[PDB]
């Protein structure tokens, strides 16, 4: 029994790149609402 | 709109338009506070 085992290279590369390129909270102001709001959010959001 | 449900719906029209030729979506009537408007009732776009 013996593999190629082919599909590994494809899935480990765009693993790598999804890694290099994240995407994680951030906060935009709504409309009617103030913008300086994000801070607000994000203040607490780092720290724990 | 701030809420994914009017970004989701997009991205499911697009894919249904080149994939099987048809896709739509839905504007819905609801009360809702947690997006505030004049009197609190808005319409959101749900997909089909």
Known sequence: RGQF???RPV???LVSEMRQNPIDVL????DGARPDAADVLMGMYRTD | MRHNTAKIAVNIAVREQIEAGVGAWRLVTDYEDQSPTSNNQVIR????
């Open chain 1, 27 to 30: 906060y935009r102001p709504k």
């Open chain 1, 11 to 13: 899935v480990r590369k």
């Open chain 2, 45 to 48: 776009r749900e997909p089909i």
């Open chain 1, 5 to 7: 085992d082919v599909v």
